[PDB]
Amino acid sequence: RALRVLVDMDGVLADFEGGFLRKFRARFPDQPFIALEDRRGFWVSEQYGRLRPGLSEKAISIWESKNFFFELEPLPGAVEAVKEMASLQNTDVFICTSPIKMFKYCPYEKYAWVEKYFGPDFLEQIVLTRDKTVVSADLLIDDRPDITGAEPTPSWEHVLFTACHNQHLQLQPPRRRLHSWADDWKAILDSKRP
């Protein structure tokens, strides 16, 4: 039997936080912003809303804009790590990502992004869903702390991928982290093998 690993896209493969900040500052130069070092909480618009009135609506307009997802930069070592992971024996890798509600560009751009960095053949490994608990696997590497859905008992072990917004979070045992792609991801996968 092959080990199945679900790899998240935003915050794990694609730099959503960095891309957001860069484009927000460029479009709203006279507005206050939040340095990544100061990001707290999964929801960007919520922390921006607390910064000053009207920043939430502006933040939202950034990711709803054409080319936001397509132009995100890969996280350091992400492409290299996933390519190697997918080539490993007895290992099936799927990119499991949740598209935003405004569907005009997001779904399309995510497929285009994967084609760009992983090639045409990797498109077969993409799973788009707003509920990752109904996708079965041994592991789910994702930066969102709370991953819930229709399935109360997911088959996967959620390994928290470190991001600016979750770096200070204390996890309840035996929950663990993958600190970055430079961290030992192979050791994590092996711990799940027969």
Ligand SMILES: Cc1cn([C@H]2C[C@H]3O[C@](c4ccccc4)(P(=O)(O)O)OC[C@H]3O2)c(=O)[nH]c1=O
């Ligand atoms: C992946 C990511 C998106 N956003 C943005 C983008 C937008 O995505 C969703 C949204 C909710 C649930 C599943 C998918 C998208 P929306 O419900 O608008 O589709 O929730 C609110 C918004 O929050 C962040 O702030 N941080 C993140 O790490």
Ligand SMILES: [Mg+2]
């Ligand atoms: Mg993510």
